[PDB]
Short mmCIF file of C-alpha atoms and ligand atoms in Angstrom, two decimals:
data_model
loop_
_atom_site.label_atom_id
_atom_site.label_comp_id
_atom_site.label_asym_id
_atom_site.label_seq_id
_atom_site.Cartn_x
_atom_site.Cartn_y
_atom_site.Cartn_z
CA UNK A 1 21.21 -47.58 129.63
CA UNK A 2 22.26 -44.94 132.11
CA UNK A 3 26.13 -44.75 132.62
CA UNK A 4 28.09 -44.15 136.14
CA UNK A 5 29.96 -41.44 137.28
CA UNK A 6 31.82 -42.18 140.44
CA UNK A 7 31.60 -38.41 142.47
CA UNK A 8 34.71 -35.86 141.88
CA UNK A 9 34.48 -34.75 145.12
CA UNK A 10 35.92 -38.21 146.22
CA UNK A 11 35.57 -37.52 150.30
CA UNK A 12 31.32 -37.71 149.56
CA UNK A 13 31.54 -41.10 150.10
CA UNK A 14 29.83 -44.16 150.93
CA UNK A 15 29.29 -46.30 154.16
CA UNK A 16 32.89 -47.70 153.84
CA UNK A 17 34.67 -44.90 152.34
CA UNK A 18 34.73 -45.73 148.25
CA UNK A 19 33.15 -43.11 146.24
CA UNK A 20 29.46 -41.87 145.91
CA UNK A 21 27.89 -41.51 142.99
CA UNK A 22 24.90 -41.91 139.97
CA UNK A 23 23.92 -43.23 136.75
CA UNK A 24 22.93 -41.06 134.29
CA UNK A 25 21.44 -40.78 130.29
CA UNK A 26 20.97 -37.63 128.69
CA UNK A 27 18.30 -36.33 127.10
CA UNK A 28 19.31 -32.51 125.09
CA UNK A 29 15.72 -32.30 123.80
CA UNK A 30 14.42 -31.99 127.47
CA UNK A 31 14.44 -29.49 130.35
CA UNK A 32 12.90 -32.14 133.06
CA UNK A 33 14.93 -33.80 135.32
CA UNK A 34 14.35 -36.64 137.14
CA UNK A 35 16.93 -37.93 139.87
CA UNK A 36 15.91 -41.51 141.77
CA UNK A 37 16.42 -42.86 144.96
CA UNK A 38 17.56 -46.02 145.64
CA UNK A 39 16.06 -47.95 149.06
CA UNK A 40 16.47 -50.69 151.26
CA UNK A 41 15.91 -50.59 154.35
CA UNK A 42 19.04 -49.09 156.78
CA UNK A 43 21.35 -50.24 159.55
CA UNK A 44 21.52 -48.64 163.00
CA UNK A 45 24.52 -49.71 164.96
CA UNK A 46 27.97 -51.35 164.44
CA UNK A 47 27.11 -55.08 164.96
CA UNK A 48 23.56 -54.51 162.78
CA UNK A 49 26.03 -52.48 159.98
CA UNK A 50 28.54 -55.34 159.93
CA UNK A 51 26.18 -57.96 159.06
CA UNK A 52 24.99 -55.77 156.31
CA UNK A 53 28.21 -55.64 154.92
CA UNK A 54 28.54 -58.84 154.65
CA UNK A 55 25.89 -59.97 152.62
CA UNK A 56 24.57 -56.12 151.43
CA UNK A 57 27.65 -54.81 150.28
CA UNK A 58 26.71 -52.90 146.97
CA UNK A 59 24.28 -50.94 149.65
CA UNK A 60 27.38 -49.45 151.59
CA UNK A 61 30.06 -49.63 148.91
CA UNK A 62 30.60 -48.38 145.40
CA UNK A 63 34.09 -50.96 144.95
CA UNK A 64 31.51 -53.81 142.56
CA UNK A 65 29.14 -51.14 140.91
CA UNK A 66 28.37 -52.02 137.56
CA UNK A 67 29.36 -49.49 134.85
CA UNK A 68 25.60 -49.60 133.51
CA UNK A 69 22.01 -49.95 134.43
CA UNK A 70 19.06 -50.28 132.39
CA UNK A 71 16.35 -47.43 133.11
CA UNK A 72 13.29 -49.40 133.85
CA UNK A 73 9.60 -48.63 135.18
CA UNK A 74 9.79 -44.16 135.40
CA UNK A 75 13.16 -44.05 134.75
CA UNK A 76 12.48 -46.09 131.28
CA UNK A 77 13.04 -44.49 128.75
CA UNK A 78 10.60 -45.97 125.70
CA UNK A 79 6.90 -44.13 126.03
CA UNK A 80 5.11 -47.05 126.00
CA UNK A 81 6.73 -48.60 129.29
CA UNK A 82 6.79 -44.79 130.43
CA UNK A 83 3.73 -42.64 129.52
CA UNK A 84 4.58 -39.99 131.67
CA UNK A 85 8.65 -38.87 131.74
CA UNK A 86 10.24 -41.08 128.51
CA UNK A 87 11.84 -38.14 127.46
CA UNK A 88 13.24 -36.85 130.42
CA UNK A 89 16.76 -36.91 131.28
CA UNK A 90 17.28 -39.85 134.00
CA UNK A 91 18.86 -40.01 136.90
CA UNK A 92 19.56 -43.13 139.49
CA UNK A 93 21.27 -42.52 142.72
CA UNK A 94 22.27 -45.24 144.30
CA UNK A 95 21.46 -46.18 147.89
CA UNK A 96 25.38 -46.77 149.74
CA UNK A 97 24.73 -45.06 153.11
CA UNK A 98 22.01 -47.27 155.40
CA UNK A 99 21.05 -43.84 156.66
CA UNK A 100 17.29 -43.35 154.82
CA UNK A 101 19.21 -40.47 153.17
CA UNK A 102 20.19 -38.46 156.42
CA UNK A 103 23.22 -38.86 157.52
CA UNK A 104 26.45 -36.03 157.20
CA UNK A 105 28.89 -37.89 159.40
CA UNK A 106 32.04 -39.26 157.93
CA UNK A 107 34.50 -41.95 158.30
CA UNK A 108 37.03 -41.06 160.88
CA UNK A 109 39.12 -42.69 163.90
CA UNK A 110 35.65 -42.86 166.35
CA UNK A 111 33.60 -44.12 163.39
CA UNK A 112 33.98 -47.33 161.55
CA UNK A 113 31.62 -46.10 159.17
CA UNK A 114 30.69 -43.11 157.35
CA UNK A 115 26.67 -41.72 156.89
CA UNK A 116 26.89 -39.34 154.22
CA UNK A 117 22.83 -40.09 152.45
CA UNK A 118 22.02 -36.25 152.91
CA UNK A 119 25.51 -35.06 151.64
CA UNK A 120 25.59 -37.43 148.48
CA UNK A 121 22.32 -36.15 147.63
CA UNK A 122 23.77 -32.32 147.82
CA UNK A 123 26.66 -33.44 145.50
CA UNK A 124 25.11 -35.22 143.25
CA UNK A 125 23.28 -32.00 142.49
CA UNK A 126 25.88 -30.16 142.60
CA UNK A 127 28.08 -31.59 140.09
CA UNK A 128 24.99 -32.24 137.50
CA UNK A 129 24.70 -28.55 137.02
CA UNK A 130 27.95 -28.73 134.79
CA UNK A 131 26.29 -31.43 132.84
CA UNK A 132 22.77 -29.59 131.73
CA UNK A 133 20.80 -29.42 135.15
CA UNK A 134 21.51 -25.25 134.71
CA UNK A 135 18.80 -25.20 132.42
CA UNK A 136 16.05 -27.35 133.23
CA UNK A 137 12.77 -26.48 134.23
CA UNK A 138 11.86 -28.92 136.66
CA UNK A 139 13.97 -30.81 138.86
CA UNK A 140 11.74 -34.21 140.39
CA UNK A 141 13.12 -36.11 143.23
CA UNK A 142 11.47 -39.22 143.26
CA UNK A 143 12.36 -42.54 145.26
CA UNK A 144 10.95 -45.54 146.60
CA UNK A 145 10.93 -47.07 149.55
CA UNK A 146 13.80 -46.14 151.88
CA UNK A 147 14.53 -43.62 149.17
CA UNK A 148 10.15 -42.52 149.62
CA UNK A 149 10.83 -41.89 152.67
CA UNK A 150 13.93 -39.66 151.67
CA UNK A 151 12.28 -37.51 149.19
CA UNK A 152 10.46 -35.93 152.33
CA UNK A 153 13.17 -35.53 153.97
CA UNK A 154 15.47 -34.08 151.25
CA UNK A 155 13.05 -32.15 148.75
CA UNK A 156 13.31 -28.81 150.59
CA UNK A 157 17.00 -28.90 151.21
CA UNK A 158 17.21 -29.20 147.21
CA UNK A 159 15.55 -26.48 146.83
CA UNK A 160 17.24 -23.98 148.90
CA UNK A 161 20.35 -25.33 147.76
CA UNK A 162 19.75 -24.36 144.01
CA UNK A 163 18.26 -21.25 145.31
CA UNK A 164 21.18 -20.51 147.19
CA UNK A 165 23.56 -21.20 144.31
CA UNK A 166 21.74 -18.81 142.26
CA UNK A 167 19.12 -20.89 139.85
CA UNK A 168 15.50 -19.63 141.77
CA UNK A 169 13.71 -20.90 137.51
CA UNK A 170 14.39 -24.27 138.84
CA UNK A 171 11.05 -25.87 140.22
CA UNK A 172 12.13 -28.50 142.52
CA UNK A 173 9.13 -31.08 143.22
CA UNK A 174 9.31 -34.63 145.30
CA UNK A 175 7.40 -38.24 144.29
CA UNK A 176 7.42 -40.57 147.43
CA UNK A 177 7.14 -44.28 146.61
CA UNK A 178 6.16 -46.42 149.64
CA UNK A 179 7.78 -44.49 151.88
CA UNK A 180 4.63 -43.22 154.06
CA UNK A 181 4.63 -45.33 157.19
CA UNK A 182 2.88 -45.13 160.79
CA UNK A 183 4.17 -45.66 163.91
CA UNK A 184 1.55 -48.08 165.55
CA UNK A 185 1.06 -50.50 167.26
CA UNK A 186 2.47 -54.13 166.52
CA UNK A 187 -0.61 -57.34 165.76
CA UNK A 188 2.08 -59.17 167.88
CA UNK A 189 10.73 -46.66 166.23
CA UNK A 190 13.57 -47.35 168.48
CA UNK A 191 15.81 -48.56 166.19
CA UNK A 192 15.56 -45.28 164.27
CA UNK A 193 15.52 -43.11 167.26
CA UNK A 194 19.32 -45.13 167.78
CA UNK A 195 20.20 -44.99 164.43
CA UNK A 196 19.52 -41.11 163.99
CA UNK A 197 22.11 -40.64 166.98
CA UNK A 198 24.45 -43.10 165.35
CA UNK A 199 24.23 -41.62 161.57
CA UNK A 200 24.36 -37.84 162.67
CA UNK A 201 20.73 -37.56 161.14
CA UNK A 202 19.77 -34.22 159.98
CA UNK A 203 15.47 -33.69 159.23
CA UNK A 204 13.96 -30.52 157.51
CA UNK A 205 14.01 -27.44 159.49
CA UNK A 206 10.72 -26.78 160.27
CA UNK A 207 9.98 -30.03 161.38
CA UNK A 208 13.09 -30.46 163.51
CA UNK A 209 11.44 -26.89 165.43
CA UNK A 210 8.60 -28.48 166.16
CA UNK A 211 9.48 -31.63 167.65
CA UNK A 212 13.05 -30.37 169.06
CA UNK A 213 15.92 -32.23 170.68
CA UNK A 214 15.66 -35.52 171.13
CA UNK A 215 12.30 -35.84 169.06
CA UNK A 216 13.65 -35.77 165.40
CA UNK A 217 12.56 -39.23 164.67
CA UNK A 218 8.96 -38.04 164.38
CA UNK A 219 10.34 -36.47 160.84
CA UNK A 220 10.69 -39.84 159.04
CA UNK A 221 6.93 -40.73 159.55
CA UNK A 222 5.42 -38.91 155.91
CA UNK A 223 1.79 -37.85 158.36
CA UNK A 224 4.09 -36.11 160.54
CA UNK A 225 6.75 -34.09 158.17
CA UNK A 226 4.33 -33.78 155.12
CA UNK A 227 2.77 -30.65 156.37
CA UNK A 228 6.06 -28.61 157.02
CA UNK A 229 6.91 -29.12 153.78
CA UNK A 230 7.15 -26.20 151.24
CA UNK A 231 7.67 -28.22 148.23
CA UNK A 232 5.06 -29.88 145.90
CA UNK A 233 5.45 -33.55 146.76
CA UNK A 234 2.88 -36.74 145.14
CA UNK A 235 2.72 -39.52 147.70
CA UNK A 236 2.29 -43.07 146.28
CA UNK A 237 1.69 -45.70 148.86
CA UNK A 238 0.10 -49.41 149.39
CA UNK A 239 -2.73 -49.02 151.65
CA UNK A 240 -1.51 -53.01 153.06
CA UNK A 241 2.23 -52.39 152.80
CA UNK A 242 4.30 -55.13 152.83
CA UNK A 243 6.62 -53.59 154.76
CA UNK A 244 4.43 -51.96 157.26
CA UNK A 245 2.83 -55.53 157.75
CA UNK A 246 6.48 -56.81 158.16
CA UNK A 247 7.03 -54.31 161.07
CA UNK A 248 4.23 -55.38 162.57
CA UNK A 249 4.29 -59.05 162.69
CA UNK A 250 1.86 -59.65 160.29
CA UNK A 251 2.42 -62.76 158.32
CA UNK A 252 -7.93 -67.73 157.32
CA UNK A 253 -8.02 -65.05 159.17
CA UNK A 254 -9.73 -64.60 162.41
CA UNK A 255 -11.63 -61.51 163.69
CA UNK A 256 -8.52 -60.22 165.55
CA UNK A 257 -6.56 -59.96 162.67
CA UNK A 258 -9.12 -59.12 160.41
CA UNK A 259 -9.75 -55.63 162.80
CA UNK A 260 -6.57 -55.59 162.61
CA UNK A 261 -5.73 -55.33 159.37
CA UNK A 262 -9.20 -53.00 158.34
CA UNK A 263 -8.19 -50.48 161.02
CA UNK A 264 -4.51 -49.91 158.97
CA UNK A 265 -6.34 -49.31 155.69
CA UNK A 266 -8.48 -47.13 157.31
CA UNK A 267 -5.79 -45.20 159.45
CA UNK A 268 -3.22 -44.63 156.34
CA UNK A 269 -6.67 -43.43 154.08
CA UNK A 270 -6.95 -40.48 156.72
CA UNK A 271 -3.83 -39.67 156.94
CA UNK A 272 -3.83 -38.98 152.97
CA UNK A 273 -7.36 -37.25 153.32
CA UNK A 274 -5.12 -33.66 153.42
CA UNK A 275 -3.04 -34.68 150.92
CA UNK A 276 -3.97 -33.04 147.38
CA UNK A 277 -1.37 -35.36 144.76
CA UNK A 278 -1.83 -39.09 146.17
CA UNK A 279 -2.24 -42.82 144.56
CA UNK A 280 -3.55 -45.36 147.28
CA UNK A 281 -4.65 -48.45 146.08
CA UNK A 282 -6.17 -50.87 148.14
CA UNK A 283 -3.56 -53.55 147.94
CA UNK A 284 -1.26 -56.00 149.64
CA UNK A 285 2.29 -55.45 147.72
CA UNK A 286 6.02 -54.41 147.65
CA UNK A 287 6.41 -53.32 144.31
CA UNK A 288 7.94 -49.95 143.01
CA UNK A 289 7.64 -47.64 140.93
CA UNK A 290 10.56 -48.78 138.94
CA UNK A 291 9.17 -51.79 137.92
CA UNK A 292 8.28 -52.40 134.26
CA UNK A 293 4.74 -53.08 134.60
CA UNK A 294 4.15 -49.87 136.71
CA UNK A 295 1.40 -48.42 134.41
CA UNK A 296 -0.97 -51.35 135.21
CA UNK A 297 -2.85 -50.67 138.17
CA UNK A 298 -5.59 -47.59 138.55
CA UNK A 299 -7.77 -46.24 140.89
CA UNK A 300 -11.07 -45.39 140.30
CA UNK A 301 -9.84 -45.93 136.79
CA UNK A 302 -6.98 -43.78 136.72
CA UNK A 303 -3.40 -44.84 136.49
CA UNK A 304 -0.61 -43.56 138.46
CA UNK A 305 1.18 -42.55 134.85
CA UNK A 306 -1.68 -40.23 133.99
CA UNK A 307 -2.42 -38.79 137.62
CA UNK A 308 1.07 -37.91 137.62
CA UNK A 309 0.33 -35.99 134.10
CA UNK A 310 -2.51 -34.12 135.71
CA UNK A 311 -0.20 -33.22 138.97
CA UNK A 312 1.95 -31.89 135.66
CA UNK A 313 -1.15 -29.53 134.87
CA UNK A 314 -2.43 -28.35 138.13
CA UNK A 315 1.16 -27.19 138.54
CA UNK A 316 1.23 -24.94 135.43
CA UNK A 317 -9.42 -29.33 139.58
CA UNK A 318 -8.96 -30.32 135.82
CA UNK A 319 -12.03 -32.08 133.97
CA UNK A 320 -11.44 -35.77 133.93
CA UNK A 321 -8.13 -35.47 135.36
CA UNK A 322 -7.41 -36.35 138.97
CA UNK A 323 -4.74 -35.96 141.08
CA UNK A 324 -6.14 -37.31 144.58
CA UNK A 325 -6.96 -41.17 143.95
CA UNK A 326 -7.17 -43.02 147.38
CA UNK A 327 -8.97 -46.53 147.68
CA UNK A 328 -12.08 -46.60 150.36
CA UNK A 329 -12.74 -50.49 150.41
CA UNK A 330 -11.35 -51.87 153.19
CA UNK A 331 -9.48 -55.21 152.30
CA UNK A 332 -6.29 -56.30 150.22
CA UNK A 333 -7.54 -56.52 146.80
CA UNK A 334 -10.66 -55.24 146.66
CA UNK A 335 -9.29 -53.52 144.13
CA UNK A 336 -9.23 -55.76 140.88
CA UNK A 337 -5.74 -54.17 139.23
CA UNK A 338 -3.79 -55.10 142.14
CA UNK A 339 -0.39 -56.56 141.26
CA UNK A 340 -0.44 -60.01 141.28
C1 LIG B 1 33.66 -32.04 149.19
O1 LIG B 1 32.59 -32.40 150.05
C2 LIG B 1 32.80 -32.05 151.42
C3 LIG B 1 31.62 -32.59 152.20
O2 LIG B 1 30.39 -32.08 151.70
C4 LIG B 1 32.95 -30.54 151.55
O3 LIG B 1 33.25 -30.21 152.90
C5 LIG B 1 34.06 -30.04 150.64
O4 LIG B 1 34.07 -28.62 150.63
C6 LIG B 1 33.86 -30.53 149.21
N1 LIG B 1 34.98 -30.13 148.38
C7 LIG B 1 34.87 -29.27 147.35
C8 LIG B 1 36.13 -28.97 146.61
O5 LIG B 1 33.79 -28.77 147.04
O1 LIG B 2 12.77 -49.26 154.27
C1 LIG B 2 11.87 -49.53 155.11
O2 LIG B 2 10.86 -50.20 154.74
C2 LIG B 2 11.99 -49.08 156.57
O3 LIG B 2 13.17 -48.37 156.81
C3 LIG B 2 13.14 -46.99 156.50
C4 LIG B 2 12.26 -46.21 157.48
C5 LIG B 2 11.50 -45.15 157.01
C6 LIG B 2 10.68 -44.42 157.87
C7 LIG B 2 10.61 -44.75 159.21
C8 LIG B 2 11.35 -45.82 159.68
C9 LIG B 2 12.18 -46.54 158.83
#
């Protein structure tokens, strides 16, 4: 179990103004940290928020947050749910700001809402240091889906803010989860171009100089802001995502569909061919990372527990120990291991 801690700094706050905060268990015998984030999905004006809050309320208000939360998948703590981390100290940040983790805008009398995903991020490690982060060795920000996407846009910011506050034996590293999406075309970007203007969205530096004013969307698409990046950062990612499919309007398939659906495989292999620390697998799915049965699927008979290991290694190519695993056949479940 990993207990809550509502933020001290109480104006860090979510979408409707209650508290930030995270759920932690300790571990003294460790110096690795690993702090989670939370996804689903976002909200990008006031009519699309309100709905949200309606019927998503935990995901833009602290006020019903239980006091406790099992750790589960990465974040378990038992080694033989979690080969990789169980001994880690655990962190889960949850997801209250429908901002993909970018916003620093607060509540005030022009805006119903406040978008504070980039701030509560900042604060969060901020007020950990007082609790044992001082002396860790590594410091992992990993996150899935919604929270994938804001590892890459966060990771570097962490790390000049603890080198900035004085702690430069801190190695800060990022683990996106399905979070890695393209910006194609539909089988039958806007709305995050609108919601950036509406959240206050802030992207890393170097990215926001290339694309400039106006452009900063392009940052939330992994191909795009991966290569600015100074930070070690393993990509995990569904070659079929079900969410990418979902954006798409993909729902016995005929030859439209089935170039369809090859060409997407194909496109999201390339744009991992650069990428050194990766785990594609060749499957149709929307599970995470925190699930319990994580440590089941491989590629080329590697699973993502141990390739996360030998990223572990290279950071101190290793014999029989990969770190770039990408699927080349071309169809949801070619690979056997899928999740079913
Ligand atoms: C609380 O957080 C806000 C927003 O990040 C910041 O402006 C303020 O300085 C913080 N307060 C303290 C005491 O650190
Ligand atoms: O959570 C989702 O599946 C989608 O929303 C987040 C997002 C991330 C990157 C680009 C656009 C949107």
């Amino acid at each position: 179990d990993l207990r809550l801690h509502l933020l001290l700094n109480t104006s860090v706050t979510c979408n409707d103004g209650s508290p930030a905060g995270y759920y932690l268990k300790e571990s003294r015998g460790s110096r690795r940290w690993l702090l989670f984030l939370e996804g689903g999905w976002y909200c990008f004006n006031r009519e699309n928020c309100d709905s949200r809050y309606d019927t998503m309320r935990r995901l833009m208000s602290s006020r019903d947050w239980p006091r406790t939360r099992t750790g589960t998948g990465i974040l378990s703590s038992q080694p033989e749910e979690n080969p990789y981390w169980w001994n880690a100290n655990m962190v889960f940040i949850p997801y209250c700001s429908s901002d993909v983790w970018s916003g620093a805008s607060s509540k005030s009398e022009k805006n119903e809402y406040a978008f504070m995903g980039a701030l509560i991020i900042q604060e969060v490690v901020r007020e950990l240091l007082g609790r044992g982060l001082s002396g860790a060795k590594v410091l992992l920000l990993a996150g899935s889906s919604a929270g994938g996407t804001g590892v890459l846009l966060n990771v570097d910011r962490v790390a000049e803010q603890l080198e900035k506050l004085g702690y430069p034996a801190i190695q800060v590293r990022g683990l996106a989860d399905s979070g890695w999406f393209l910006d194609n075309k539909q089988y039958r970007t806007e709305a995050i171009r609108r919601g950036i203007r509406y959240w206050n969205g802030v992207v890393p530096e170097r990215c926001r100089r290339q694309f400039q004013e106006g452009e900063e969307w392009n940052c939330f698409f992994g191909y795009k802001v991966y290569p600015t990046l100074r930070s070690p950062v393993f990509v995990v990612q569904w070659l079929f995502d079900e969410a990418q499919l979902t954006v798409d309007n993909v729902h016995p398939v005929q030859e439209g569909l089935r170039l369809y659906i090859q060409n997407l495989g194909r496109e999201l292999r390339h744009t991992l061919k650069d990428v050194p620390a990766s785990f594609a697998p060749a499957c149709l799915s929307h599970e995470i990372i925190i699930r319990s049965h994580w440590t089941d699927v491989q590629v080329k008979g590697t699973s993502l527990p141990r390739a996360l290991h030998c990223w572990d290694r290279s950071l101190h190519p290793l014999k029989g120990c990969p770190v770039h695993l990408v699927d080349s056949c071309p169809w949801p479940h070619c690979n056997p291991s899928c999740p079913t």
